[PDB]
Amino acid sequence: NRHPADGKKPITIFGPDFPFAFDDWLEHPAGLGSIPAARHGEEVAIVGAGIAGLVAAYELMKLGLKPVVYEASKMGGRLRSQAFNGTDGIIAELGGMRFPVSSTAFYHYVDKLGLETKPFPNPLTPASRSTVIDLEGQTYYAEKAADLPALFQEVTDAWADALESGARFGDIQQAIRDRDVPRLKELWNTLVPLWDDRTFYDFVATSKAFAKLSFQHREVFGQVGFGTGGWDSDFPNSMLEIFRVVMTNCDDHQHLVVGGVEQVPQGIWRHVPERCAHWPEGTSLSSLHGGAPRTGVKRIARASDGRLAVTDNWGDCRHYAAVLTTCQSWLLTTQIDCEESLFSQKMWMALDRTRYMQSSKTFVMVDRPFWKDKDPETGRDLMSMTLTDRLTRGTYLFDNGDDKPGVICLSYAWMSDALKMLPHPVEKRVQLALDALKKIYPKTDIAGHIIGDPITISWEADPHFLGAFKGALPGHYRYNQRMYAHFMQAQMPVEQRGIFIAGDDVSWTPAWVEGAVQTSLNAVWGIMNHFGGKTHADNPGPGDVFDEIGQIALAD
Amino acid sequence: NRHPADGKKPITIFGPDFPFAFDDWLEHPAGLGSIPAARHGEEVAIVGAGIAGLVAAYELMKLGLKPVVYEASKMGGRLRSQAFNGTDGIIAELGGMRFPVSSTAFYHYVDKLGLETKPFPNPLTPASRSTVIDLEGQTYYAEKAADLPALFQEVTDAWADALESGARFGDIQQAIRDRDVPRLKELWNTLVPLWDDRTFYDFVATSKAFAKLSFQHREVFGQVGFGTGGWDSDFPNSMLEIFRVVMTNCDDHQHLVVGGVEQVPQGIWRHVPERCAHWPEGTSLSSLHGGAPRTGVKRIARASDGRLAVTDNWGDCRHYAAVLTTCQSWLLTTQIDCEESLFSQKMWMALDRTRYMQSSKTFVMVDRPFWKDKDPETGRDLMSMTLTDRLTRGTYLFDNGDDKPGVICLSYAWMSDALKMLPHPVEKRVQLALDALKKIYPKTDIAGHIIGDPITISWEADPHFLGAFKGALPGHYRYNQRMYAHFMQAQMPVEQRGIFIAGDDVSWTPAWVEGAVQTSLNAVWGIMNHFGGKTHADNPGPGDVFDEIGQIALAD
């Protein structure tokens, strides 16, 4: 139980758009349901061996199907843990790195695997010893929030007030705690039509609290943020997306997975459940595949026999009664030739109009966590978690024990600040970061502690992603609602049935692994239903309650 | 005279933020002023040989200085015309392509060089024979606006009414026509605090006209636009930016330069004025350089003698009393080591927070303008200017005469639609565009007419730009105001004087060539002033009236 020890019922990612108890579904001893025995052993294609792909595969295998996973690049997708030269257990998190404990469906799989987690070192948490804020050449050091000048407290207070006055934050959170669905939906559904079409930035600037403060206060709020770095990158996003972040504590109480979160997908791959339908004891996704996913998918089409024909990179064509796609949504045009008649024209527009955000990270390894040392004159740590308006933006320090090498994320950038780095090689990104940090820390010799190889990523640049994660712009609620409900196919024409989607791009909470796991499980219900299956009476699943508690539809 | 023949005083790009008559300044027989003879021949460095750099060089040469232009990549910057294999006069416009005749300072140079222009083929203009709109698989063909279904006219009506009700469009345009400065500033200054912090989308959705229409109406408005393609890409931008586009007719009455707009910067380079101060007859920028700009700049610092030290790619270091930089703003951090004390901390923030937009274009050549042929059954053109929600977005047809080859821009994309193409090679971009067009035109064999080589660009990818052009996000008014005014140095500390900036990123109107020219001319005044010069009493210039009619400052 990683929840904060505050004596309350815990905040979880429980809707608010679809407040279904994924955790309870997953933990119930009846299982996720059954498929008729005569269909046991039939294949279902799953494009993408990211977390959504492998979650859907694992559970469908448990239901007595043979998932067939395809993966065009690397195992784990945006959960990716690259090992530094010559080390064991020392990694850089290139995608997902800090996992809110509200992510109960994600953590089900973490615990099923027996993996260890620890608090992530976000600013001003017990996990981080100190934080340095550097803005317009003015540098502030703090071991607790009270060490900061008054403006920073004025900003936090205004933010908390805008959420309470503007969104009924307190009431929503209590309903989440209690899992009081009618109440949560009443409270949430009111916000949906009021904020789809307005931005994060608009919410802030027009709120009472910020409107009476200087421009500089909301500016500073953009650059330094509310617990997890500056979110000026997301000022443009629809406010509903942000409401979702804060209401479900995605931005608080976060852990990193010891040894790398890539152990989650790699472990699901290899995991042998005690009880599968159909399959013999000792069966895993890996044993069913003979060890690897298939190669990348090049084409999806409807075959004359009514099945879906999937052709790989090397022209191998295989037929399936159903196909789940988990690649980011653009790839169904840019990377796969997906026959158009497989989605409605309304669906294509959702898939095609979804915006993906940009992200950069640059990492080095260091011989020891030297930042813990004290400057004798000042009493400060030699280095801190760094928030700045310089090009690095966010710098994060990873302590692996005094007797092991440290890891430093030199820069974690979003959007514009990511785009600055796009065409530059690793050596240049490192240099620029180190020069930026030398300005903030003139006395600290970081370069002198650096060992191993540097590691960078730009998710935008990779043709298998075309972005770090979705970001909902204002007015995209309708596209999301279509994509999120696509697993409910009882009213679709026959020509559109049997193909499914999932991923954090399908979810209402992109950039958060829980969104990939929950939509993945919705698709599991959908695929089960497609094979003539159904949930157990004592353990109803997504599609059994979707029509009553799913996301509101808006007007045409 | 390329202005519309409507018998009115023409709309020009006259403010509204700084309603200075650049064209009058330029055309006045007295010239732009003078610099004391004792400083004739001294050097001023100019970073970048795009339009802002070459304009500033040209005029400073005329004032008796020796500009020294640096260029790290290609001549002309974002005015780029690439010639297709084996051809003469047949180009693709990779940057700037359609130049609003309201751009009177830009067209001063076009006409000084004697270049020929013709109306650009935008949808439903005399320059275009027909337009095809393709949305959610429904295709509409039109030779005049009246051929379109009713919804499209409801959209245009609502857009025009939102501008009239919401922005006093009529009154502002009249004040622009009359060059009534007090009135224009009154009418504009009211809008500045009201729309800095709000998006284009918010302007549209909350306007009376669109709020009573369906979502689908503003959705279609995003995909199809108001004369120059769909601008859903800019829905996130501050509304002040859009107001500036429409109020100054940037989006109407556009011409292309025959033979390519790159002839403008290449012609300025080579142009020999009748009278320069100091320089002998026959002097050009080219003759003054020996033919070529210097190579790229790697560093700018304050030398111990007070001058500015500029070090090129090859380590050659040269000293200057002044330096103009015209590269896009990020490059003063990514591409040049620009000493931090050379700009104020408020300026660095403007420079570093500015957002750059993405843009893609894919072009092919064809043996003849076969699109003009008629399908005998339908009476339609074989192909039209195409607006679509497919990945191409906008397709443009260039007729060079029946006896010459045609040029087709298969796709001109912004933002997300640009990002789709980022990592893909030209061949892939062409194929995707042709497969999208096949769907819209199943009977037209475009591929069969294609000849020559394909041409693509992604401005985001190029380390000498890092974007196509700035796009002001809500709340960016203050950063633009800082950048726009930086050429006024009378109250700066000494350590910050002598460096200047210019470019369409400095301007209020990014993505428009007139913004680069006007800011370039402000920099001209600033540099003249820096060398102890002044304008002629009968021809006052930017910095002589800036304190009285320049851009309003906003509160802290």
Ligand SMILES: Cc1cc2nc3c(=O)[nH]c(=O)nc-3n(C[C@H](O)[C@H](O)[C@H](O)COP(=O)(O)OP(=O)(O)OC[C@H]3O[C@@H](n4cnc5c(N)ncnc54)[C@H](O)[C@@H]3O)c2cc1C
């Ligand atoms: C920089 C960054 C930081 C993040 N930080 C956090 C965080 O701190 N906390 C958090 O909770 N979440 C975080 N996330 C989000 C998290 O990583 C995602 O929600 C999740 O990993 C996405 O999972 P997915 O299954 O939806 O898709 P993916 O991980 O994208 O998996 C999809 C797979 O499809 C593959 N594919 C593509 N094309 C084809 C093809 N033609 N054929 C076959 N396969 C193909 C891809 O290679 C990929 O492996 C972060 C993401 C990024 C990018």
Ligand SMILES: Cc1cc2nc3c(=O)[nH]c(=O)nc-3n(C[C@H](O)[C@H](O)[C@H](O)COP(=O)(O)OP(=O)(O)OC[C@H]3O[C@@H](n4cnc5c(N)ncnc54)[C@H](O)[C@@H]3O)c2cc1C
């Ligand atoms: C896709 C696109 C479409 C456009 N369409 C239109 C249009 O339709 N109508 C219109 O009016 N305008 C349009 N524009 C805008 C127009 O192209 C610009 O406003 C203008 O040409 C930019 O001039 P500039 O001098 O500001 O900068 P740039 O043209 O970027 O010039 C800066 C120069 O400096 C160089 N440089 C960079 N780093 C260094 C270094 N370290 N040292 C030396 N030099 C360096 C660059 O290589 C470049 O040559 C468009 C722009 C784009 C990208």
Ligand SMILES: N[C@@H](CCCC[NH3+])C(=O)O
């Ligand atoms: N341009 C620098 C910052 C200089 C100003 C810092 N206050 C950067 O992005 O890192």
Ligand SMILES: N[C@@H](CCCC[NH3+])C(=O)O
């Ligand atoms: N969940 C990620 C991304 C947050 C920004 C969302 N656009 C993080 O905590 O870093």
Ligand SMILES: N[C@@H](CCCC[NH3+])C(=O)O
């Ligand atoms: N995915 C296709 C569009 C299919 C739907 C078109 N109405 C594209 O981006 O071009």
Ligand SMILES: N[C@@H](CCCC[NH3+])C(=O)O
């Ligand atoms: N001048 C460019 C403007 C692009 C939109 C600017 N955000 C064009 O006409 O195509």
